[PDB]
Amino acid sequence: MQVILLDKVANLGSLGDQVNVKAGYARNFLVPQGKAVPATKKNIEFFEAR
Amino acid sequence: SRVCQVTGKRPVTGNNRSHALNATKRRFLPNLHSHRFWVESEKRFVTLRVSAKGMRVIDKKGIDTVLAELRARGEKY
RNA sequence: GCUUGACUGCGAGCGUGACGGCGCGAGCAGGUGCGAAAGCAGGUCAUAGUGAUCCGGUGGUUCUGAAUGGAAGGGCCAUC
RNA sequence: UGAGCCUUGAUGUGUAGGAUAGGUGGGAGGCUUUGAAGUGUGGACGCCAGUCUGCAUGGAGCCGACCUUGAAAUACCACCCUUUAAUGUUUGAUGUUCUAACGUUGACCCGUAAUCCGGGUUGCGGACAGUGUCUGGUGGGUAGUUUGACUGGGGCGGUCU
RNA sequence: GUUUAUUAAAAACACAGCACUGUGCAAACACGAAAGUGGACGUAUACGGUGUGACGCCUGCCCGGUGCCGGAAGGUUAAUUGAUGGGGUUAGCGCAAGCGAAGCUCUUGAUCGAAGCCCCGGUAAACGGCGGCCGUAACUAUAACGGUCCUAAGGUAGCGA
RNA sequence: UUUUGUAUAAUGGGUCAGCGACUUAUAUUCUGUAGCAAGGUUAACCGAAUAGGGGAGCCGAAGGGAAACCGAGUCUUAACUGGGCGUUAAGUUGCAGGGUAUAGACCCGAAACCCGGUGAUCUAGCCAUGGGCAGGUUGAAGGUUGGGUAACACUAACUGGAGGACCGAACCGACUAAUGUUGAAAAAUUAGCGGAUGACUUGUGGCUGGGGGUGAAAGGCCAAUCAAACCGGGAGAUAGCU
RNA sequence: AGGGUGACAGCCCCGUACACAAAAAUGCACAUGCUGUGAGCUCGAUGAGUAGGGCGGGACACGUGGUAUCCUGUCUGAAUA
RNA sequence: UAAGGUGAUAUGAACCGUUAUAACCGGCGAUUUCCGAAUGGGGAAACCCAGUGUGUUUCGACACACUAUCAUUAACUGAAUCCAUAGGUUAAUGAGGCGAACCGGGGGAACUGAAACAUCUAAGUACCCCGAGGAAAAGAAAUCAACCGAGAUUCCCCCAG
Which residues are in coiled coils (chain B)? Predict the structure, then answer.
């Protein structure tokens, strides 16, 4: 879905991008291993402040 | 048991309505899967008996918010 | 030869069935066909050529229209 | 590799005709020294009929009802249709590789002097397998039932309006 | 040897043997909603199913039908995908005859689409089939033999009174 | 009792006494009776509790048509000389009874179906641990020596003791006949008969449960029973039958 | 009221109507004390894998029918006075 | 409260008491063997076999006390693995079981009726299972109504076969 990147990711990422990703590549790789977070419109200001 | 741990969904019964409307009893099994989840707060691979809808709920609420609901009703995980 | 009465709305009275029904019917109202006219024609000389109901299909009729204005559906007439 | 979508470029031989005219709109001046016609080639399309354009010679012009066409302009400016090509996005299909879901009735460590199970490491498979829902075929393995009546008893034959 | 305890002890059942087929182990198969177990702490010289029933001589012909095994260009084909078309409603426009935007909604279901079936090829120690009709020729007369019937093929060996 | 018809040799009763079968609840219609009368009448509830209060509501004095609608008329049709249905007949509430409806519905009686439990101390198969098979006979493989062979073969005694082997008690089974048939016995006795070192038999304990088990296969067995055990429940199943 | 006493009892007896009683335990009432709980006013905030939809069912008298509403096994999926 | 009394079959025997400690009845206690949720482990229920702690004018043997499982909380220890968790020990509190009906919820037939029977009916009935209470359940409107309004839920009578 709408996850935002956080790292030195390959060629879809620029340290934070709103992309259209699938659910299976979202969880177990990008959810809790690091590097992403689901964009529930509360975290879009919270981690950009970080 | 075939009970979803997150959403509490349990198998219900039904009928196989044919072309001649003959009633035959059967069950409605959920799309349950034993998925291994990772948490940041406890640093542990936590396996949970969840459904296909249960995976959809746990993505929006979060991996740690659902465990607060299992904490409140005394479930084990 | 000319033609659409193989008309529509009705119908006193009667035959015939346990019933559902079926069969005959002068006459009236409307509009016709034929004959100059009186008149005759509501199918075939008559009696066999048939199927109830339910659920629906089609056309017409605003008849009904679960707040109102419609509509869906139902009903009635024709018909499968 | 099949499709849409977005810029970017090509693309249109009924026939008379200065000539391989896409249609509607504004439209009698735009463009050229922010260097033009007209000649000379490379790449290229293709019904080899011709055309576009980089480079370059060139060194100051070409146009419009022009007469013809069922419809007039490479005079310019617009949104575009026909067909076609290459980048770029999007959605599917096919094939390869890979790991992180998932499988492990391979190995090892610990709970634990424990053949289960749970946790961890690692190997091998791997988005297959299998499961859930929906759905086509198969299915006496099983379940509920049906298989008519008159009839010189029943059956055979025959009949039912 | 076994069996109808309690009317049938056998020509029945079983039997080693033979043959077919399934099965590469987390096996096929089976008990179980499942877990798990049996199979088996076994590994195709093994296991499960099926028919036949020591041994000796042997086991012919026929794949059309029905089953199974594959093969697949096409036909047909579910869920799904919702392309078009029709209808209702009304902002507006028409003194009205009516028409009808957007949105919502009813309905219609082109295209996509697997196995199966049709189709194509095998398989009889698969279920099964192994037939008629006419014409002769030593004493009855055979059916050697000769035509036909294309439904796939018309009794081989051995036995029979 | 049932029949066209019973002394019927058609069914039923040994006798006596007790017991035993057209009910009840709620609705509706009809009749009788009683009250009021174009009106009649309450239900729950309240309650000075069978009074009284309560008129929610039901039924009747108006019908016709599918209906809108119209109305002593209405429908049918363009409209009916008409026609169909109505107007010109007092109902209503109790009580008793004759019926019907729903309930088991006059009483007794099925074979079976379904659910929840109980049983492998009998029997079928299996698992674990133990036991039993008197006596006699046939004399396999192997072994040794001699004969025999060019060398094996082959053969002779001796040795050895194999067998779902032979005969025959215990034990297990039940082929034939008699007795037995309200038996001594709800399958037995006597005399013959089969197996009897095996696919045997047996004690004790364990496992497999009903649409299931097990079955060297009879559709047998699963507590004197099995073409689906037993018990309890739905259940007063149902019966157009006696 | 009723029962008994040698056959049928208002006056024989137990009782009956009526009039009374609780050391102790306990029920229900009010009154007060104690410790927590929370009042009243103003200003807000508004319950998302949820409503709804496809397929497959179930429940509403209503059997999918033109079928509203409610529940959901499956697959998805809003708006924010 | 009392002049009688030691329950009954059931007498008899031996006694008690008569002016307040005979008996009878009521409240509160004491005792309460063994089995049974059975709870120290087992068990063919009324039996067997222990652990820890404590006690002897007789420190042998016996007697006294405690020791189930699960849930929460707290303390102490404690792996693979560094932290950390899993796990282990101990303590406090609570739960367990029985019981006739009623209530809610999870599952859920068939006979029969349809003059057969499959949709249907029987019927969410019987039964099974779980949970709770003196009642339970439901309960303050995303409810009805129709342009007037009503104002949670439950129960009864009508509407109405």
Answer: none
- Check CB contact of B63 with chain A, cutoff 8 Å: yes
Task: Identify whether the C-beta of residue A20 lies closer than 8 Å to the C-beta of residue A5.
Answer: no
- In the PDB record, what is the listed experimental method? cryo-EM
| Domain hosting residue A43, numbered range | 1-50
Distance CA B30, CA B10 (A): 7
What is the residue range of B55's domain? 1-77
Q: How many domains does chain A have?
A: 1
Q: Where are the alpha helices (DSSP H) in chain A?
A: 23-25, 43-46
Q: Do A33 and B38 touch (CB under 8 A)?
A: yes
Our CA-based measurement puts residue B63 at a distance from the nearest CA of chain A, in whole angstroms, of 9
Question: By a Cβ cutoff of 8 Å, what residues of chain A touch chain B?
Answer: 23, 26-27, 31-33, 38, 40
> Which helix H or strand E contains B70, and what residues bound it?
helix B63-72
Query: Helix or strand or coil: residue B47?
Result: strand
Are B63 and A26 contacting, i.e. CB atoms less than 8 angstroms apart? Answer: no
- Counting the structural domains of chain B, the total is 1
